[PDB]
Each structure stands twice: as C-alpha cells, then as structure tokens.
Design a protein around this ligand. Structure first.
Ligand code: HEC
Ligand code: HEC
Ligand code: HEC
Ligand code: HEC
Ligand SMILES: [Ca+2]
Ligand SMILES: [Ca+2]
Lengths: 376, 124, 355, 124, 376, 354
C-alpha cells in the first residue's frame, strides 16, 4: 500500500521533527540473497551501458554498475562477487580498444580486480549470458572469442591475471562443469567437452549429434551449473535437456512446450531470454505467443510452465505486458521475473500463480538480460 | 502537469519531482538508484561541494536551506529525472546555480554526475 | 541553589588568591573584556600566556570560554569519531574536570597541591559561608572536597548566560530582527556551501537549536610549529604536540596531531588564531585552510610572512577529505567570509570589532 | 503495427522498418544518419564482413539476396531503429545471424556499431 | 511533397530496374553552407553524447560526431572546420580523466587534431555555447575553467598544442573580439576585457557596471562575433545590448521584448538557448511564454521577433510545439530553428512568417544546443 | 558471316602450322578437353607450359580461355582502379591484341615474325579461300593484314557460345532448374558473405546478367615465388614478376606485384592454381587467402609442404584492406567453398570432377 518513496518521506519528516542527525555518506547495498536480481541494459548497441542491481522482494533499485560496449555479466552463485567482461575505447567509440574483466564486491560495488584481456579478444554480440561464464569454484572466468576464430579465454580471478586462449572447433557458448572443464555447442549439432590444464593443448571430446540441421536451437538456453542441467529450446518450443551432472553429457528425452493444436495455430516461443529453469523445483518456464515463424525475437505475452521430468504442462500465464526475457529466483516460492525491453520495466510475478506483484521501471534504454544467483 | 505553472511542493513522496526538498534539484533523485534522501548509492563518491536553495516545507510552513550534494563517478542514473529552479540564479552567482556539475571534493577525483542528495543545512 | 553555585563560581573566577604568588585569577588569562581570552603580551606576543611566576609560558594559545558550556562531554560517537571534551586536546572530560587543572599547573596558577588551594579558600570568611551553604559544613577542611567544590562552582558559572548570550548579529538575523548586508549574506552563503559547514557547524544535517559553529570533533588541519611560542614554552626544538593522542587513554596513532574544532563565535575578536596562536589576522586563518585545496603558488604562501605556511608539526592524519575541496577561495569570497564571521561577535564585543 | 504478425514488405520508403530490403536488419538504417540505402555516413568505417537474407521485393515479385554491411567506429546512431529477422538463424549458423556486431574488416579496426546498409548481392 | 525516404526508394527501384551498379562506400557530407545546422545532445548529463549535423533546407541528418561528458562545440564562421572540447574517463565515468580538443574536417568529419589539455581543466556544466569560443581568425580556441579558480585556457589550433591558462577575476563566459582579446561577464555586474599574450599577466580592464545585482542575466546570451554584438536577455525579457565592434564595450539602449501588459500577465522568456540574433537583418528572436517566475528553464511555445535598433516588435510566432532552444540561419530569408528537448526534434520554420516548414526527429536523448556558421 | 569469321578462328585455333616447328597449336596449351588449359607435365609439373621448341618453359600458369570473352577491354576506371584486359598482368588490351602474342613468343609458338605466319597461312588453300572471302583478295599476301586477320578470327572464335556456355550447375540453379546440395549451398553462402565477393564477383552490387566470378581488377595477394617453375623458366633467380606494373605505359609503383583476378568458372578442373601454378589443390588455393587473417595453422602453414607459405615475391601493395578480414576460414567452410566452386564447372567438364 504505502510506496517506498512515501515511507521515505515519512521517515525524513520524523527525523527532522525529532532532531535526529545522520551523516551523509555512501551506502552499502544489503547482503546478496535469493531475491536479488540483476538487469543488464545493452542499450540497443550503445557504446556505454548499465546494469541495475535490484531487490526483487521490495521492487527497489539497490545499486548500479557501469559497463562499456556490449558487456557480459556474471554473478557468483554463492553471492561472494559479481563481475563482467567489458570493452572501452580511447575516444568513446573510436581509437584504441581495451577489453577487460572487472570483479566487484557485491555490497560496496567497488572494483576489487581490473584484469586487462590482451589483443581485444571478446565477442561483441547482442548479449548472450552463456558467452562468458564462471567455473563452479568461482576462481576462473571463461569468455568466448569469435574473431579471428572460435576460442575460449581463461581468466584467473584468484590471481587476477589473464592466462591464455584455448583454441576450439566451430563451437559456441560455454557451460562450465568443473574447475577445468566446460561444454560448448557445435555447428554440426554435437556438444564438445573441453578439458584444460594450466599449460598445453586442451582435451576436446564430442558427443553424438543431438538435433538435425533444420531444428533451430536458440541463443538463450537456460543453464543451472549447480544442477548440471542445460535446457535448450528450439524455434518451435521443442525442449532439449542435457544432464551434465556426472561430468559427461547425458541426453534426456525431448519435451514439447506447446501442443500439436497450439503449434498448428501459430503458437511459438519468442523473445530474448525465452527460457528459465528452477533447480529445486525441476521446472521449465517458456515465453510463448501466436506469431509468424520469423518473428522469433519479438515480445511474447504468455509463459508456459512445465515439469522437466515428465514434460506435463503445469500452468500457462497471461503476463499482461510485452515481455522479452524471463528468469526466476532459485529459492522456495520463487519470483518469476519478466523484463520488457520496450517498457524498460522489470515486472515481478509470483512464479506459482503468475500474478504480478510489483514492477521496477526506468531501467535504461533497452534492458534485455536478467541474472540471479543460485545460493541454495 | 503544466510545466510553466508555479511549482507546488509536497511532503509525502521523496521519489516525485514536486517533493519539497527538490525545489532546486537538476539531475536525478539519488533515492531512485540505491541511495537515500541524504546518502549516495554504493560505488559512487560523495562530493564535498554544494549548491543551496531555500525550499518551503508544506509540513511546517517553514523554509529550509538545502545544500544539495552530488554523488559522482558513475554515468547518470536515468531514474527519477527532475529539473526544478526555485530561486536558481545564473552561473556568475554559482552558490545558487544548478547546471554546474558540483562533484568537487569527491574521492578519487570523481567528476561524472550520477544523482543528487537533498540534506537540510539550516532554516532560511 | 543553582543561581548561588554560579555566583560562588563568579567570585572564584576573578580571585588571584587561587595562584601561588597571588598575581593571577582565571580572569587574568580569560579576560571578560576580550571575549575571555588573554590580552597580555609575553615573549611570543599574544600567542601563549604567562603564568603566575611571571616567567613560564604555556605552549598553546588561551581559548575563549564563551560558549564552552555547549560542548558535550568527551565521548566517541557511532562513527568512531571522538567528540566533545575541553582543552585543545580534549584531555579534560567536561568543564568540571578541566577547572582544577590551571590551579595546580606550575606553568599557570602553580598552586603546590589541593591542600594549599583549600588553605587559601579557608582564609576568606566569605568562602567559608558560601561553600558551606552549598556543600555542607567542613567542606573546606577536606582538601579533596574543597577542590572538587571549587571546580563545580567554576563550571556552573561558565554555564550561565554571561558566557553564552546568543546575541550576535547572526542570532538577530536568524530571529528575524535584522538583515545581513549583501556581503555578510554572501559570506554566509559561502560558509554553508563550501567546506566550512563540514566542520564548523554543530550538525551533519537538520537544524541546530543553539549553533556554536563547531561539530566538536578533532581534526589535524596540518599547522606548523609556532617557533617563537615553542621557544618561550621551553618544551624543546624536538617536542611534538600530538593533540588528542596526548589525552591519557587514547592510544590510536590516527589521533596524533588532531585538535578540537574551535567554536567560531567571537572569532573576530579572539586573535591570534589556531591552537598555537601562529596567525595574527582572521583573513590569514581562513586562507591557511586553502593550503591543501590546489597546486597554485598562491595557496602555499603565508600572507603575514611572505613565506610558505610551513611543514605540519604532525604530517599524518590530515583531514584531506574535507580540505581537498578542489575550490580555492578567491579574495572576494574571503572578504565575504570575514564579514560573515564578524556577525558571530556577541553584542557586548561589537565595540571591539573596530580595533 | 502488430509485432508478431507476418512481416509485409513495401517498396515505397527506405526509412521505414517494413521496406523490403530490411527483412533481416538489426540496428539502425544508415540512410537516417547521413548515409544512404547502400553507403555509410561520413566519419564511419564500412566493414567488409556481412550477413545475408533472401528479401522478397513486392514490386517485381523476385527474391534478392541482401548482404548487409555495418558502418562502424561511432556510437549507435539512435535514428530509424529496426529489428527484423526473416530467415534469421541462431549464432551457430552465423552467415544468417543478426545479433553479431559484423564490424570485421572495418578500417582502423573500428568495432562499435553505428548503422546498417542494405545492398543487393544476388537473386534467390 | 514526397519525403526523403520515398524519393530514395524511387531512386533505388529505378537503379535496380536499370541494372545500375554503384560501389558501397563512405559518403562525404555536402559542402558547408548557410543552411547547415548542428544540434548537440548533452543527453541529460550522460558520460557520452552526440552531435547531429543537419541540412536545414532538406531537413535531413547529413552526419554525426560523438563526444564525451558535456562537450562544448564550436563551428568556424567560414565553414572551414568544426571543433569540440570534450572529456573521457578510463572506465566509462570513473578512473583517469582526459580533457582534450578535437578539430574535424567539415565534410569527411574525420579528426584532424586531438590536443590534450593538461591537468583536467575544463568546466563541466550543462552546455553554454560561450564557455568555449574561437577567436575571429579561427586560430585559437579559448575555454573556461572554474576549478580550482576562474581561468581561461588557450589552445593553439594552427599549431595543435595547448598554450597556457590565464588567471582571470571572478568572471564568466568568453566573447572573443580579436586574435588576442575576449570579454567576460563579472559577478560585480561589469564586463572585463582580457588582452593576453603567450606568457605574462594579461591586461584586464573592467567596463562600468551595467546591471544591478538583482537583475539576472541568462546563461545563454547571443553573440555575433562578425557584428561584435552581444545580446543578453534577463529573466524578465529585458534585453541588454553591448556593441564590441570598436574593440571596447559600448552600451546600447536596453529594449523590452515583452509589453508592460504581457509582463503584468506573467509573460517571461524561458528555456535553454532563449535568444537568437540575425546579423544582416539586425533582429532579435526570444523564446517566451506565460510562466511562473522560477520556471525559467522550461520550454516555451512562442517566439517574439523585434528590431534590434528600435526595440519594435515585428512578429510574435505561435510555434505549436514545446521549444527549448532557438537559433537562426544567417543568410537572406533565414530559417528559424526551434529545438524541442522533450520531443528530441528540431522544427525548422520560415523566420519571416513563422510557418513550420519541416522537422528532424530522433535527435538523441535530450538535445539542447543549436549552432550555425555565419558565412556571409 | 560472323559465323564465318568464328568458323575460320576454329580452324586456326587447332592448327600447329602457327608454330615454328609445327609442333603446337593454341589448343596444345589450351586443351578443350581440359577447360582450355594445359594437362602436360614439364620440369615444374603443371605449373608452367613448354613451348614449341620442346624445352622453353614459361614463367606463368596457362589460364582458361573459357569466359575470357566477357572481360572488358583494359581501362582505368573513375575510381583509379585498372580493370580488364588479357594475360595475368593485363598487358594486352583485349582478345584481338592478345592473339598474335603467343605466335611470336620464342618460349611459346616461336614464329620468328609476322611474315612467317603469313607464309604458313598462304600455303593452305582453305585459308586462302576462307580469309579472302571475309577480308578481300590478297589479304594473305600482306604479312601485317594476314596477322591482323588471324588475330580477329581467333578472337571471334573465342567469343562464341562454345567458350562461354553458361551451363554449370550454378547456372541451372540460378535459373531455378535445380537446387544446390546442403554443402554447396553453405559454400555459396560463405562465398557471398565473406571477402570472396569483394573480388571474385562482377559487380559491387545488384545482379549480374552473365556472372563470371571476377571483377576484372588487379590485386597483389602476397604469393611466394614458385621456385621450381622460376628455375624451369630460365628468367633467373634474380628475376621479379611485377605483374601489372610490367604492362607498357603503367608506371605507377602501387601496381607492382598485382595480377588480374581470375574467373572462378571451371576452377575445379584447371589446377594448379595462381599466376605461377604454385599450389596443386583447390583447398590450398583457398587457404592461402587465410594467410593475412590469424596466427593459427590454417593461416601460417601451407598444407602441401607442412612449412610456412614463404615470403611474398612483391612485399608491397598487398590487398590488406580486403584480406585482413578479421575472420579465418575453418576446415568445414573450406570444404563448403570447394563444393560450391565445383558447381561452377561447365556441363561438359563434369566428368573431369571424377
Ligand atoms: C593563563 C596562565 C591561564 C589561566 C590563569 C587559566 N587558563 Fe584556562 N586555559 C589556558 C590555556 C593556555 C588553555 C588551553 C590549554 C590546552 O592545553 O589546551 C586554557 C583552556 C581552558 C578551557 C578549555 C576551553 C576549550 O577547550 O575550548 C577552560 C574551560 C578553561 N581554560 C578554564 C579556566 C579556569 C576556570 C581558570 C581559573 C581556574 C583558568 N582557565 C585559568 C590558560 C589559562
Ligand atoms: C575540518 C576539516 C575543517 C574545515 C573544513 C574547516 N575548518 Fe576551520 N578549523 C578547523 C580546526 C580543527 C581548527 C583549529 C586548528 C588548530 O589545530 O588550531 C580550525 C580553525 C579555524 C579558525 C581559527 C579559529 C580560532 O583559532 O579560534 C578560523 C577563523 C576557521 N577555522 C575558519 C574556517 C572557515 C571560514 C572554513 C571554510 C573555508 C573552515 N574553517 C573550514 C577545522 C576545519
Ligand atoms: C603454351 C606454350 C601456350 C600456347 C601455345 C598458347 N598459349 Fe595462351 N597462354 C599461355 C600462358 C602461359 C598464358 C599466360 C601468360 C601471361 O603472361 O599471363 C596464356 C594466356 C592467354 C590468354 C589470356 C587469358 C587471360 O588472361 O585470362 C588468351 C586469350 C590466350 N592465351 C589465347 C591464346 C591463343 C588464341 C593461342 C594460339 C594463337 C594461344 N593462347 C597459345 C600459354 C599458351
Ligand atoms: C581480392 C583481394 C581477393 C579476395 C578477397 C579473394 N581473392 Fe581469390 N584471388 C585473387 C587474385 C588476384 C587471385 C590470383 C592471384 C595470383 O596472383 O595468381 C586469386 C586466386 C584465387 C583462386 C585460384 C584461381 C585460379 O588459379 O585460377 C581461387 C580458388 C580463389 N582465388 C578463391 C577465393 C575465395 C574462395 C575467396 C574468398 C575466401 C577469395 N578467393 C578471396 C583475389 C581475391
Ligand atoms: Ca585565539
Ligand atoms: Ca591453373
């Protein structure tokens, strides 16, 4: 009922009336918790960008981090830090390029490391969360390079130093499974396992091909490192699930997010981050709407929820806004976050009933990516 | 709102441009980017310089000197933009001028504008 | 009772029998005709005061007693800032704990001990009546009760309206009785928008009921040794005044070189300035605060001497956060600040402003 | 203006997002910032890399291959933004992918995205 | 009355049908002319900003220039170059600050000089055109420093090098009158004439005081270097004129842009660049509206046009939009330029009839400053 | 009529009487069974051809005559780029000016002069008949007129449908008679989105009516000397092939080391590759262009030798703007390009794909 701005006015008038002094100072953000959510604004390709740190429970912006051109954010699942890989130029968008990793303290937001990446190795692309990734121990950051050829850069966060590039095959995305291992997705339809030591050529093993060439896997799969679970939709809403918890890829039976009836009536996923996964509950969430087949990047107004073990539909929500990306908090009674690029607003829903609880507006120019920590 | 109408303060919501202490704010209200009415957001640097206005409090009918301060060292927050100019004078009377980026004295020589806080320093 | 205690303190305050040779009272060094500071010249000019032996000089400048009763007792606040207390180094907790010290200090009033002070009080039939009425029969026969009683009385006298009248032009303007000139208003404006408000205002925010233009904290602003005063004091070329760190029980080396922020009330008439009286003119005291603002040649030079300000006596724990403000005061703004600070002169000392 | 409806090309205005050649543009039309349908604005650097779509031309009923080129080395123009995705595939089929900043080969190693041109390279 | 996008589609279709080949390339802007207009976008204090180069006759963007934090643009009167003083930081909005001046070719828009300014001396302020100014030979750029003490920086554009700072009194703004002389406005209500050399104390001479302490002179005066005319409105629409064409200040009779009746009914100027001056017609244009006295930076919807010699009103145009800034082209039959910060649109009017002729939208985030060359 | 002139040219083209010892015709080095290139092995393999004397080898690889008729006559365009002409260095303006050159070149057909060519023409009754009918009685009696008329007929024959039939898989696919395979289509998509389209396509934009996969310009791609062909040619270890700067009247030092961009029609059956025949395999020819893109092996190492490509013969005027693309071809895209280039093979040479 009483908004934040109103309770703040009441508290200030009371301090003033009672003579309570307080020293103006720099605040610290509250402790990271299950309901902290990060919204990154790539700003429709602008040279500088912003990340908003939000308390999902209150619907309050609790801090911000500035980034450069198309930065990739990461958030340690244990809450111990955040970091990004970013890119700046000597004269705004022209001149000498510097790519770099910053690590920030999650309560003061101060940089605790600034690690330059030599030879401008970052992939500059509309933001894909799994193009820059932390190892489960939080000690290493892995980032993708596309030019001149696919490679993965190894950054030692513990020792604050760039280490080396690992050359890889025609592969995309980085799903780390151990301090020294990650999977990627190949053009040919297989996954590749990349094992790497401190020195030497990495060991690279391919799985069987798991999808045909005419089945299109989206740029925004969900990956739960603590579950070892990769959830990968196609353009039609067919959902691939790969279990990586044994250290090797085990392909689960594919599930359909949409019915035969709905598909023949033009229901298809669409958006940016189209899929979310809740580990404790073992549940997939998918942004869908009725759309032409080549309108796959447009907003969707509905979310379907399905059991990951059986593929049964658990719920279908009318969101009430044009939603581009979703994610969930990883606690019990999770929040379902539904970011609208066009409204620049984060709508915060109860994930079980789909009901809208609160919203956070004025999130930059074209916000697109939601990130949460899995602290459980 | 008619933007040319006389400004009308309130003392019930600090996130609105008509909040009484924001009578000469130019920029963004710090409370909307993770600070508070009189504290800066994490990661920013509190300037030591200020600008003053005399702002009428409709709560007690009294006018108070607000010595605004900037939180500096980040790009502009973009949330709760406001520009009010009650008693605001041109730049040759700078103690009352609000287009200047008043980030002087901020730690680490921070000079970029993020948001502004509104503490009271005295009664007019 | 409360009136009577202060009236006893009033007699003691002007009584030279509390000094060894009977030449000196509190009022000798805290002269009511000079906002309770020392008009007398010694081997260092007005920078430090001469004790009852006629030869010993102190090593700190005698401060005003006006508004001293508004200072909170010594404590460390929430933020780990020490605050309040008495003396430039806060080594006395409050006025009552401070009052007995000049009496027994051999460079000041030089009484040998509490018994000698009791014996002086006992000599005077009016003290016997007035002490016994307030503190009980026999008070003056017990050196400890007598001494503690005299200090209570002196502290009560300093808490009266005589010492803290709030009748300066600044107070009249705040009440709506008078208006500032344009220059005084400009100086007020500068004081509250530049860094002065960060140290010489009671509160961090909100409004003070009885402003005395000090936050009662302890800061090292990097002042040099006053060489003529330090020679007169006889403490040695190698002596360091550690300010707050010299208070017994403070051990934190971050406290070294910090002194209590003085009240600016009556500042216009209480030259010379700073804890060692090193600057003669108010303008110079304000300009010294520009020293750490910028890199300009002008900021490094003492206008009174034509020479650099000097190396800090304590070159660590400087209050650089507040002082490195990135704005140098131009001469127009220093004129305005002087005009403003003159409005903090109590009404009865306005006649002193001309001189 | 229904965003999820099948896209309907026109051949009468190159500054609108439904102009037929823009069927897989992602960014801004260069004609709106000082370039033209197939030329970069002054001060920017024309990349040599490209992406391709088959775009139907309603006027002559033929399909053409448009190999889009980015104009690089300036912050994004902000004028005539458009995102179409006709035949657009995911990143692992990059010749058809349009989230990539295709600034490779630009003079001066320019890599920031300003706007996109829409030249025909072939029939489909 | 086909639009530019329609003429282009018709031309492209004709080339396609003709089989005409053309090589994709980098265009040159058309030659600078009287109807070229520059719009700067301070973007509400964002760390990076943009300038739009516009052909006012076609209503077409012909180019853009990127800048840093709150840059000051200048344009040489003869069309030979444009330049800005600008500010960047090593990590977007923090770390090491670099202030610099760039000079650009007016047709290729490429930087022809990048001149560092030592010790970060620029005055960071919402953009006032006469806080950075060219001498009339276009050989020297002068810029204002506020911190730590008022000073003017001298930049040799021909030699591409910073020259010196000059100490000045408590004065603001910089109106160059000769290769070695400019005027500033003093807190005390006088102008100061500053004549400087490569080293040594400048000769500083004050005029008489010309206004009282309670008459407030706006931050955006018009100054025609070629006419030597300084046109300085107050908050009430009183206009001071100073003739600097002799090399010394001569005070002209003040004029009232609004009638007594209009002033009594609450008419006052308001906006950002509230005033324009046309040299060849000797005419003053002032943005006015009915407003409370402390709403002096809000948009206005009317422009009053008056003869500068007599003060007689020539017209009062109803603009039909919320206008913040105005300027005019300096040729015959001039255009009146009317920039709306809230619409992010430049509206281009016939300055004789006040009729809106065309407009250019999507000009950045909060465009505020219009600059033209006086090439006549 | 122009049937007639071309029919004469068809006769001349396979006549070894146009060589000094009658051992070789145009068709000997431009073999119609091999898309009009040279199948014979000499001292440098198929890199360079052996002339009429049985010993002299040239210093450049013999190119296809297929599609050569579509090349414009040599000129400098308004963009300052030279374009068109014949020979790898463009030193002949057009096919007519080129035709007499091999006849008189001592390392090729080695006729000592035009008078010797006329004498061989005049000795053939069919040539007296055919030439006099098109050019007038006595044409074969004047050496300059005879030699000029022989060049005109040969140029006319090379401009028939026989040399440019436009019947490759690629042509049939463009006419919508068939479809590419998945791999071929991936190859085509790479070809038109990577740098290849900036040099090996007729136009900068729009659709070409009769595409031959060259823009007719001149580029130095930084090729090393082919040491064994250089040796065989006899021109000496000190010789430098300056490409276009060798054309008489070209003086501009920026043209040094530049060569005419080859049409890629029939490329799959016309190996070895480049102006000096230095690479035997089509995959190697493509990987060579990867050289200025990366430090990885698919960039620095020649797969035919396992060693680095070797220093450019002419280290200046490299087409770095086009070649330093920032993107290296991986093996899968090289495989796809090879499959696409194979579709540029004329119908009659499909059996050679083999
Ligand atoms: C000169 C010989 C003095 C006589 C006699 C008295 N005092 Fe004084 N006083 C003197 C000095 C030099 C100082 C500063 C010394 C230091 O170490 O800091 C003081 C200080 C005080 C204070 C503290 C005021 C403040 O810190 O703001 C008080 C309250 C005070 N003195 C009271 C006082 C009384 C009551 C005296 C008679 C008993 C008395 N002083 C004598 C110098 C001299
Ligand atoms: C805290 C960092 C301060 C700021 C900001 C300002 N002042 Fe200050 N001032 C300070 C101290 C700790 C002291 C005493 C220093 C010592 O060791 O002696 C002072 C002193 C003065 C004085 C002299 C007062 C006297 O001797 O009785 C004056 C006149 C004064 N200060 C004025 C002043 C003004 C005008 C300021 C804003 C420009 C200002 N000070 C800032 C602590 C601090
Ligand atoms: C082998 C000894 C040859 C004989 C016999 C003929 N040609 Fe040839 N041809 C040969 C080489 C080595 C070259 C390249 C030489 C160089 O310096 O670049 C050529 C080239 C041509 C061309 C140019 C084709 C192109 O540039 O794309 C034409 C049109 C050509 N040759 C025709 C031709 C005719 C008509 C001949 C009989 C008179 C003939 N050639 C003989 C190798 C040999
Ligand atoms: C201009 C800078 C070019 C680009 C881009 C590409 N190629 Fe090229 N190619 C070019 C020239 C000037 C030459 C001849 C070089 C010489 O001096 O000999 C070539 C050659 C080839 C060949 C061999 C053709 C033959 O020998 O007849 C092939 C197969 C070839 N080029 C293919 C090719 C492809 C697939 C490209 C994109 C990856 C490509 N080239 C780029 C000029 C240029
Ligand atoms: Ca003093
Ligand atoms: Ca060959």
């Amino acid at each position: 009922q009483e908004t934040q701005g109103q309770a703040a006015a009441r508290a200030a008038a009371a301090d003033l009336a009672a003579g309570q002094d307080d020293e103006p100072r720099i605040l610290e953000a509250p402790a990271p918790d299950a309901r902290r959510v990060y919204v990154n604004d790539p700003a429709h390709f602008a040279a500088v960008t912003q990340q908003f740190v939000i308390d999902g429970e209150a619907g309050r912006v609790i801090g911000m981090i500035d980034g450069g051109f198309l930065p990739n954010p990461v958030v340690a699942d244990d809450g111990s830090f955040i970091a990004h890989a970013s890119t700046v130029f000597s004269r705004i968008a022209r001149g000498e390029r510097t790519d770099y990793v910053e690590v920030f303290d999650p309560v003061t937001l101060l940089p605790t490391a600034d690690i330059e990446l030599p030879d401008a190795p970052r992939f500059l692309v509309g933001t894909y969360p799994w193009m820059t990734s932390l190892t489960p121990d939080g000690k290493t950051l892995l980032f993708y390079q596309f030019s001149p050829a696919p490679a993965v850069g190894v950054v030692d966060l513990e020792g604050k130093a760039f280490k080396r590039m690992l050359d890889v095959p025609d592969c995309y995305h980085i799903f780390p499974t151990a301090p020294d291992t990650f999977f990627m997705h190949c053009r040919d339809g297989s996954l590749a396992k990349v094992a790497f030591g401190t020195e030497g050529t990495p060991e690279i093993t391919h799985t069987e091909v798991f999808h045909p060439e005419d089945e299109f896997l989206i740029n925004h799969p969900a990956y739960s490192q603590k579950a070892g679970r990769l959830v990968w939709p196609t353009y039609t809403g067919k959902i691939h699930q790969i279990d990586l918890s044994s250290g090797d890829a085990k392909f689960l039976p594919a599930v359909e997010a949409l019915t035969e009836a709905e598909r023949a009536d033009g229901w298809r996923p669409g958006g940016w981050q189209q899929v979310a996964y809740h580990r404790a509950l073992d549940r997939i969430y998918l942004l869908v709407d009725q759309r032409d087949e080549w309108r796959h990047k447009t907003a969707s107004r509905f979310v379907v929820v399905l059991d990951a073990k059986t593929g049964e539909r658990l719920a279908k929500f009318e969101m009430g806004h044009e939603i581009d990306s979703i994610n969930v908090s990883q606690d019990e009674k999770p929040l379902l976050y539904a970011l609208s690029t066009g409204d620049k607003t984060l709508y915060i829903h109860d994930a079980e009933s789909g009901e809208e609880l609160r919203s956070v507006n004025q999130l930059g120019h074209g916000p697109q990516v939601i990130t949460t920590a899995d602290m459980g | 709102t008619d933007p040319r109408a006389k400004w009308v303060p309130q003392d019930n919501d600090i996130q609105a441009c008509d909040y009484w202490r924001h009578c000469s704010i130019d920029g963004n209200i710090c409370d909307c980017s993770g600070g508070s009415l009189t504290n800066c957001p994490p990661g920013t640097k509190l300037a030591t310089a200020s600008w003053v206005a005399s702002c009428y409090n409709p709560t007690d009918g009294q006018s108070y000197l607000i010595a605004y301060r900037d939180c500096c060292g980040y790009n502009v927050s973009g949330r709760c933009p406001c520009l009010n100019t009650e008693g605001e004078l041109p730049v040759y009377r700078p103690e009352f001028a609000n287009d200047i980026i008043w980030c002087f004295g901020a730690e680490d020589d921070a000079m970029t504008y993020h948001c502004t806080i509104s503490p009271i320093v005295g009664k007019a | 009772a409360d009136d009577a205690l202060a009236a006893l303190g009033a007699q003691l305050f002007v009584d030279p029998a509390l000094s060894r040779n009977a030449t000196q009272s509190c009022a000798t060094c805290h002269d009511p005709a000079r906002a309770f500071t020392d008009p007398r010249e010694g081997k260092a000019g007005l920078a430090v005061s001469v004790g009852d032996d006629g030869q010993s000089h102190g090593d700190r400048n005698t401060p005003t007693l006006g508004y001293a009763a508004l200072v909170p007792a010594f404590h460390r606040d929430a933020n780990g800032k020490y605050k309040g207390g008495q003396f430039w180094d806060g080594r006395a907790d409050d006025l009552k704990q401070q009052a007995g010290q000049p009496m027994l200090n051999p460079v000041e009033m030089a009484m040998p001990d509490r018994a000698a002070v009791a014996a002086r009080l006992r000599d005077d039939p009016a003290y016997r009546t007035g002490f016994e009425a307030l503190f009980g029969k026999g008070v003056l026969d017990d050196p400890e009760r007598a001494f503690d009683a005299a200090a209570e009385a002196l502290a009560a006298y300093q808490a009266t309206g005589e010492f803290s009248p709030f009748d300066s032009k600044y107070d009249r303007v705040m009440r709506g009785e008078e208006k500032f000139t344009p220059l005084e208003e400009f100086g007020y404006t500068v004081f509250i928008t530049w860094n002065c408000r960060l140290c010489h205002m009671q509160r961090k925010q909100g409004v003070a009921e009885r402003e005395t233009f000090t936050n009662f904290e302890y800061h090292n602003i990097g002042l040099p040794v006053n060489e003529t005063a330090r020679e007169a004091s006889g403490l040695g070329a190698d002596h360091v005044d550690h300010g707050l760190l010299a208070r017994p029980g403070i051990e934190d080396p971050a406290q070294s070189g910090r002194f209590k922020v003085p009240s600016l009330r009556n500042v216009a008439v209480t030259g010379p300035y700073m804890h060692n009286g090193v600057f003669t003119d108010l303008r110079t005291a304000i300009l010294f605060h520009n020293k750490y603002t910028s890199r300009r040649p002008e900021a490094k030079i003492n206008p009174e001497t034509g020479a650099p300000w000097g190396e800090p006596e304590v070159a660590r724990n400087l209050s650089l956060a507040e002082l490195q403000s990135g704005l140098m005061l131009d001469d127009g703004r220093v004129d305005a600040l002087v005009a403003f600070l003159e409005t903090l002169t109590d009404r009865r000392y306005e006649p002193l402003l001309e001189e």
